[PDB]
Write a sequence for this structure.
RNA sequence: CGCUCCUCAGUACGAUAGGAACCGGAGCG
């Protein structure tokens, strides 16, 4: 499967934000999630880490929030995320940088830290069930929204 | 006392997608 994200990027010459169509291979994104550690933070880059998808640790939805519908029961279930995100009963979503070229993000480096880019592969803790590809609409900041596939 | 860098630490904390400080190290005023 191929996922497409439209990410606005600032063209210097026109000083205006333009739509860049970015394509991701699900197979490569999944491989990225397997190469990354099964932890929540605790790495030099901070990734991978808990993706709340609008909930708090007790599966309670933050008011005025619509979680992303992934289409897989495991991915759409309200999460159970304890303090360290390592409880022996936890189940929640993790986000990790993913790129069109498929390379593995250098999760262990803090200084300098690799640019995570606009996209993330979202997968479950602790079985790493693939959920989807999400990305920032503008540059590398703001909320993350589900890309198409 | 103030400012820059390291470290503390991607820790504490946070959930608008981020993120300290004390102690300690190196400087300038
Ligand atoms: K954390
Ligand atoms: K400091
Ligand atoms: K100090």
């Amino acid at each position: 499967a191929t996922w497409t994200c439209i990410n606005q990027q600032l063209n210097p010459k026109t000083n205006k934000w333009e739509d860049k169509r970015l394509l991701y291979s699900q197979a490569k994104a999944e491989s990225n999630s397997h190469h990354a550690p099964l932890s929540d933070g605790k790495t030099g880059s901070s990734y991978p880490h808990w993706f709340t998808n609008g909930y708090d640790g007790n599966g309670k939805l933050i008011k005025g929030r619509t979680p992303i519908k992934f289409g897989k029961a495991d991915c759409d279930r309200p999460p159970k995320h304890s303090q360290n995100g390592m409880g022996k009963d936890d189940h929640y979503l993790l986000e990790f940088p993913t790129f069109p070229d498929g390379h593995d993000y250098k999760f262990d480096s803090k200084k300098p830290k690799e640019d995570p880019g606009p996209a993330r592969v979202i997968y479950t803790y602790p079985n790493k069930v693939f959920c989807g590809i999400v990305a920032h609409q503008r540059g590398n900041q703001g909320d993350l929204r589900l890309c198409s596939h």
In short: Chain A has one domain: 1-149. The domain at 1-149 of chain A is CATH 3.10.450.30 (Nuclear Transport Factor 2; Chain: A,). The pocket of potassium ion (ligand 1) is lined by residues A 40-41 (CB under 6 Å). Helices of chain A lie at 26-35, 73-76.
